[PDB]
Tab-separated table of N, CA and C in Angstrom:
chain	number	residue	atom	x	y	z
A	19	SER	N	-12.516	-11.226	23.663
A	19	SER	CA	-12.365	-9.735	23.020
A	19	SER	C	-10.784	-10.202	21.740
A	20	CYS	N	-10.175	-8.954	21.363
A	20	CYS	CA	-9.994	-10.037	20.257
A	20	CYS	C	-7.913	-9.258	20.148
A	21	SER	N	-6.934	-9.844	19.130
A	21	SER	CA	-5.392	-8.589	19.348
A	21	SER	C	-5.847	-7.219	18.142
A	22	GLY	N	-6.038	-6.575	18.478
A	22	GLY	CA	-6.910	-5.324	17.405
A	22	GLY	C	-5.135	-5.212	16.836
A	23	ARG	N	-4.884	-3.740	15.842
A	23	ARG	CA	-3.511	-3.853	15.075
A	23	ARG	C	-2.230	-3.638	16.274
A	24	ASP	N	-2.243	-4.276	15.348
A	24	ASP	CA	-0.139	-4.407	16.189
A	24	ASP	C	0.115	-5.421	17.287
A	25	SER	N	-1.298	-6.158	17.994
A	25	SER	CA	-1.368	-7.168	18.633
A	25	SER	C	-1.161	-8.241	17.725
A	26	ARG	N	-0.292	-9.289	19.206
A	26	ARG	CA	-0.038	-10.864	19.114
A	26	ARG	C	-0.672	-11.849	17.961
A	27	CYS	N	-0.296	-12.650	16.647
A	27	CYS	CA	-1.054	-12.784	16.107
A	27	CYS	C	-0.543	-13.460	15.095
A	28	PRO	N	-0.816	-13.967	14.689
A	28	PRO	CA	-2.235	-15.517	14.570
A	28	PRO	C	-2.665	-16.337	15.285
A	29	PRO	N	-3.477	-16.647	14.885
A	29	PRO	CA	-4.998	-16.867	14.510
A	29	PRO	C	-5.749	-15.970	15.319
A	30	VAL	N	-5.325	-14.736	16.619
A	30	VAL	CA	-5.619	-13.647	17.684
A	30	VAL	C	-6.400	-13.017	16.637
A	31	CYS	N	-5.620	-12.382	16.470
A	31	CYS	CA	-6.253	-10.946	16.365
A	31	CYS	C	-7.864	-11.085	15.162
A	32	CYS	N	-8.056	-9.655	15.466
A	32	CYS	CA	-9.648	-9.396	15.341
A	32	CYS	C	-9.801	-9.085	14.010
A	33	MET	N	-10.929	-9.073	13.961
A	33	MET	CA	-11.925	-8.979	12.290
A	33	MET	C	-11.148	-8.489	11.325
A	34	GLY	N	-10.519	-8.682	10.524
A	34	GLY	CA	-9.723	-7.853	9.239
A	34	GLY	C	-8.526	-7.615	9.243
A	35	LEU	N	-7.630	-8.183	10.378
A	35	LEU	CA	-6.128	-8.328	11.238
A	35	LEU	C	-5.926	-10.094	10.926
A	36	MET	N	-4.496	-10.073	10.574
A	36	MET	CA	-4.273	-10.699	10.394
A	36	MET	C	-2.950	-10.465	10.990
A	37	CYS	N	-1.313	-11.414	10.768
A	37	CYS	CA	-0.041	-11.164	11.644
A	37	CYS	C	0.960	-10.844	10.166
A	38	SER	N	1.218	-9.743	10.310
A	38	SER	CA	3.136	-9.300	10.061
A	38	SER	C	4.513	-9.658	10.374
A	39	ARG	N	4.410	-11.100	11.208
A	39	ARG	CA	5.104	-11.683	11.744
A	39	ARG	C	5.175	-11.771	13.007
A	40	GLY	N	4.133	-11.144	13.802
A	40	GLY	CA	3.858	-11.157	15.017
A	40	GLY	C	3.421	-9.945	15.756
A	41	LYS	N	2.308	-9.220	14.516
A	41	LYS	CA	1.464	-8.361	14.893
A	41	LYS	C	0.376	-7.549	14.188
A	42	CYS	N	-0.501	-7.392	14.759
A	42	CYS	CA	-1.947	-7.039	13.695
A	42	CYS	C	-1.415	-6.144	12.530
A	43	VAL	N	-2.031	-6.617	11.333
A	43	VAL	CA	-2.181	-5.789	10.456
A	43	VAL	C	-3.560	-5.587	9.716
A	44	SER	N	-3.938	-4.630	8.865
A	44	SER	CA	-5.594	-4.844	8.222
A	44	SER	C	-4.710	-5.840	6.977
A	45	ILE	N	-5.839	-6.740	7.050
A	45	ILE	CA	-5.506	-8.214	5.652
A	45	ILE	C	-5.848	-7.027	3.689
A	46	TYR	N	-7.097	-6.562	4.835
A	46	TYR	CA	-6.790	-5.378	3.348
A	46	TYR	C	-5.702	-4.914	2.892
A	47	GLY	N	-4.827	-4.113	3.319
A	47	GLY	CA	-3.578	-3.707	3.086
A	47	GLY	C	-2.597	-4.432	2.885
A	48	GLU	N	-2.678	-5.114	3.124
A	48	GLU	CA	-1.614	-6.569	3.238
A	48	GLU	C	-1.904	-7.762	4.218
């Protein structure tokens, strides 16, 4: 599995997601 949008991260997030201080967010946008 992986941390999809809003999940605890990083480097836990899914491919394309990073972490807005603790919630996955699309690297593309931010």
